Design an enzyme around this catalytic site. Structure first.
Site, PDB file in Angstrom:
ATOM      1  CE  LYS A 210     -12.441   6.376 -19.848  1.00  0.00           C
ATOM      2  NZ  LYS A 210     -13.920   7.350 -20.330  1.00  0.00           N
TER       3      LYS A 210
ATOM      4  NE  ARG B 241      -2.689   1.668   3.573  1.00  0.00           N
ATOM      5  CZ  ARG B 241      -1.916   0.896   4.251  1.00  0.00           C
ATOM      6  NH1 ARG B 241      -2.062  -0.219   4.883  1.00  0.00           N
ATOM      7  NH2 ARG B 241      -1.428   1.958   5.299  1.00  0.00           N
TER       8      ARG B 241
ATOM      9  CG  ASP C  98      -9.654  14.909 -16.359  1.00  0.00           C
ATOM     10  OD1 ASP C  98      -8.892  14.337 -16.786  1.00  0.00           O
ATOM     11  OD2 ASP C  98     -10.386  14.704 -15.013  1.00  0.00           O
TER      12      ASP C  98
ATOM     13  CE1 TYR D 136     -16.863  10.724 -16.902  1.00  0.00           C
ATOM     14  CE2 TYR D 136     -16.318  10.536 -14.608  1.00  0.00           C
ATOM     15  CZ  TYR D 136     -16.464  10.328 -15.660  1.00  0.00           C
ATOM     16  OH  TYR D 136     -16.846   8.554 -15.583  1.00  0.00           O
TER      17      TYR D 136
END
Ligand SMILES: Cc1ncc(COP(=O)(O)O)c(C=O)c1O
Ligand SMILES: Cc1ncc(COP(=O)(O)O)c(C=O)c1O
Ligand SMILES: Cc1ncc(COP(=O)(O)O)c(C=O)c1O
Lengths: 363, 366, 365, 378
Positions: free
Chosen positions: C192, C43, C167, C95
């Protein structure tokens, strides 16, 4: 004796007891004393050290000061200089001083009750206007980095003096070989020895010197009180490097001229920042206060996007973060301190041009 | 790896590419990049310096180490963590130069301090203000070797908003680990025991805390009082024998203390290892041993100079912690319990008998 | 190293010990220590994830990279830096899920937002409150491909005490590099264009700033929305063809834009590559190319669904930035008319894409 | 081939058939032909090898496709403007030398064409003045007598974005210090009479061009109007050109010594010289020019004293021309601009105290001693 001769025989350049033409490296912390309150000259290496002292004497001898002070770095020296002031005091910076000096104020000094005002220092009136009741110093740096912007030393000094002001000059770029601020009204001179003075990219050091005995008492105190001193081996290597300064500065100048000229008459190149060019703003001022121009030159290319491809395709200039060494260096102050800074070294001039050529052919 | 093995193989003690059993010396200011965007500039980081930094971090159980041009360069950068208007609590017998840092440099930079007896736990409680941001500890004390409960002090410190900073110069990492006792920051003069050969001036700082590490890292680079590669290398070399040296230091110091205490012309001996020492049990508790530092007061004060000036082995001089034995009179050198007659010994690693015979002959002259 | 080369040898593209030309997949949760005092826990750190993070830092010109379980989890972590009672400016068509992140998650945590048109630089000036900390840009914009000037908004935000957050999902690091245009934080939906193969859900975040890097690291670790090693590796693998895929995407998207524009049955067409597009000259200046994302509204608005449902090559699906062609009506899945069709132009043969459109148009009035 | 080499070997500089390291002087009006329809010279008003050799050289030196040698600077300029039809419009520099202004005013205006005088350093003034029938822009940089600098690249760009041709007078800065065809200009005109000849012994014009079709057009009017340069003068122009590089180096150095002397002088006000950093557009000047010529003008404080100053000069020759190895002096207000009313002169920046120097290639010290003594008498 002349500057050239002083670089070799100035300050202390000889062991008085043995005759050694080189000052010995006193890798020691402490010193035995005859009776208490009667020392052999040295008590503790942080306070004083025969090797460091020889170097401190050399830089004083060269800049025309009463005392030298060697430090762990350029920034440590500058820091010790500004430790002369109280909180509630004000200092006027040049608008393009070295970034670490800015960060010194921005993040260390300001934090402690020290205020600054950034102004263009080649604009004499901008300094006249910027003084407050608590302004206690004027901090100049010429030629400036990058952009090589010249400030009028005598003028600024005169102006600082009729106000109760300290003239503190960063003489790193134009060495004591080319410029002596103390002979032009400055009170305190600071260098990065890490650069030209050392000149072999192998020492990290600051040197400070002063015209004033009272100032010297103060600087001494804070060198000892804060303890950012230069070690004896570094001191010795600095001094050794200093011995060749004259010849190196000559070679630096000679090369950087060829480089500037070649660059100016180039299709890819737009503007060019070098003090040796008649084309550089305040060119006249420079010839007045400098006996020469160093090896530093920023410049820009017509196509502002290629800047990084050009720097990275060079094979003789070393892409790195310093300057003032015998090896040629290259940077882009955008990500380090479309402008490209060159530290022209002392390699063969032709090889430097041929290296720039081949990197231009690639864009 | 135990302490005695760590001193030799800890941090970075080897060259990885070449195999060399010593770290190479990097007399270099700058490094070629394949950049733009390991090492960039020697003030920000240097492999020789880094190896020593990792070493001291490793020895004290810190996350990072920091090497400074001097002990004081280290303490100074540690206090650069603080803003003007902040408050600091100090020991009443902290090293002379540390007191001078506050008095002469840091107060005029807007910090305030208050001197309390740190062995008096309630005195620290009573002295806390709303702007008190840190407590500064030195144990054992210079020059009276006074002992301070590090767990207790850090405990009271932790449950206020306070930083616990400890100068661990006298006990070194071989005999005391303040971080494992609740401290946040640990500072040494490397000029002393860590170098051990009275030939290097150097500071070392390390910390428990990742964020505190960034701050010190910032002011090490920003103020620029960094140890050079040569001094870093030599300091590392000194540290390799730290273990053996500290044992000799302790063996000799014990011997000397037991001689001075039984001596007709001597009044009190200040040494943590003496059973009759204030907080003797507390010393045994927080320390794995006592160093070579002791001071003593001689019944007739006016004879202190003559005593010091007639020693033939102990070198009359300013520092401490070397292989050679040093002597000073704190009143007249490095500078409440401190009387002009107080004599401070830095017992080196010479033959116990050579040191005793030296003191024997010097007492015969007063 | 040029961008085209950097996609293949950047960050960490090789195992140092073994010489493997691919980074090994560390399906591990923990590591042996010789402590007490590199990798401790997956982690906090995983060699595979780190390889990908270094690659993105290197691509966007950042100092550190950060891989998350999704584009949203990253955006989340970014905004997790802020205290309650702070203020943020948002693009009017950011978005859909970035709004739903603010609207329903970050607000009730004491955050405040103002929806603005960011292509109107004066509008951002009009909305600055004393408690505002950051501006959030997204250009080209979903799904209208409205363009915002990164250089100026950054400046306007920089002379105030503000953070520029971009973004960059749509115009990838291959066409646009916000960090060099005065941005502080860039974020991608790796799901994407970066993955490129419509087979990985991921988010990538990078920064110019050391202190911001410390912070994002802290919140990636504390919330734990980290990306797994297998997904990181697949993501890195995908990134290796980014340059090639982006070129084909653009070549196809320009070819489609010009088809839709000259079409009688179509009304408006949104694509930064079209000369007749709001701020086209702005696109050319801050971008090195236009991507595969375009939208268009047709003249008969009610026959949007019939069009979409009769496409045979394009896949009616819920994403973008893949090698296969995607289509969606962003309204069913302020500019957005209930007949706006959004096209994710793939890397298939343009003739096959155009012949799919011709046949679809030839079934509506 | 560097420029210094081009001046010696450029164009045609050798007789191919005999070996001769000098182009032969062709004192001939005509040529025997081989058969009908089969010449490569026919008549010397059309073609002559001596003139063609020099023509090649100026094309070669300026980076043009063809060169043109004319009986004088004017003939050459005139032949250029003979391209435009009746009705056309021309943007003209306000500091333009007498002859060129007059060429329009008293020759071209009555022949259909029409002009507007505009400052060319001020680029917006050109934009503001472009008419729909405007077909050409005529630039002179550095200018006479004030030495104003003009952006060749941007002025050529703004003209090209419209329908226009760019004609530059590159006389002052030679092809050795300036190359306008390489900064977007279409036609370059010189007075060969001046620096190109160098020895104040030839009257000649030179014109060259980038453009194949413009080359055809200029060739036509050269031959149709017959303002052609003769073979003896062509040869002498070429001869003088061989030492252009050297002469310009000396001019510049001498001009700079004098420039710096004059502005350090108590009796002087403004000094007009492009090689001074204090000069307007000195920045731009360095970018487009590789050096500054021998032309400077200066104004003295007491306006009336210019006369007494010039009359005592004993090395500077008081004379009309310029660009020769000998140093020349004039007072524009009287030598060239006496016809213009004094107030219009002062508007144009030409005071009665403006003196102009064509600094030659004599020993810089002697020239300085000359100025020193002349100043002393006033
Ligand atoms: C002028 N002043 C000060 C400095 C800082 O010197 P140092 O890096 O030795 O601290 C530099 C950096 O070279 C400089 O160019
Ligand atoms: C305890 N802390 C700090 C210092 C200061 O260290 P330095 O002298 O190396 O700066 C000393 C004495 O050296 C000491 O005994
Ligand atoms: C722009 N930003 C952010 C996101 C969120 O990405 P994810 O759904 O993978 O978290 C998307 C959707 O892909 C997008 O197009």
């Amino acid at each position: 004796m002349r500057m050239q001769t002083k670089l070799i025989h100035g300050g202390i350049s000889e062991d008085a007891t043995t005759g050694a033409v080189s000052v010995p490296i006193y890798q020691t912390s402490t010193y035995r004393q005859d009776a208490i309150g009667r020392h052999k000259g040295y008590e503790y290496s942080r306070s004083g050290n025969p090797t460091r002292f020889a170097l401190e004497e050399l830089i004083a001898d060269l800049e025309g000061g009463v005392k030298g002070f060697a430090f762990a770095s350029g920034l440590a020296g500058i820091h010790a200089v500004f430790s002369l002031l109280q909180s509630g005091d004000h200092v006027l910076l040049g608008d393009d001083v070295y970034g670490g000096t800015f960060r010194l104020f921005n993040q260390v000094l300001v934090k402690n009750g020290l205020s600054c005002t950034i102004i263009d220092t080649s604009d004499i009136s901008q300094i006249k206007k910027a003084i407050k009741p608590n302004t206690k110093a004027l901090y100049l740096e010429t030629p400036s980095n990058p952009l090589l912007k010249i400030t009028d030393l005598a003028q600024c000094a005169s102006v600082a003096k009729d106000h109760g002001l300290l003239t503190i000059v960063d003489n790193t770029f134009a060495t004591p070989y080319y410029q002596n601020p103390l002979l032009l009204g400055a009170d305190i001179v600071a260098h990065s020895g890490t650069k030209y003075l050392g000149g072999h990219s192998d020492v990290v050091a600051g040197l400070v010197t002063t015209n004033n005995e009272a100032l010297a008492q103060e600087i001494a105190f804070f060198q000892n009180a804060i303890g950012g001193v230069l070690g004896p081996q570094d001191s010795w290597l600095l001094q050794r490097g200093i011995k060749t300064l004259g010849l190196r500065m000559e070679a630096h100048q000679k090369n950087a001229l060829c480089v500037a000229e070649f660059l100016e008459k180039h299709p890819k190149v737009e503007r060019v920042y070098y003090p040796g060019l008649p084309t550089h703003p305040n060119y006249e001022l420079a010839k007045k206060q400098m006996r020469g121009f160093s090896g530093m030159l920023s410049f820009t290319l017509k196509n502002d996007s290629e800047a990084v491809a050009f720097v990275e395709s060079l094979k003789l200039f070393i892409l790195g973060e310093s300057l003032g060494g015998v090896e040629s260096l290259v940077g882009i102050p955008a990500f380090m301190t479309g402008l490209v800074r060159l530290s022209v070294g002392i390699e063969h001039e032709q090889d430097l041009l041929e290296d720039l050529e081949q990197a231009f052919a690639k864009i």
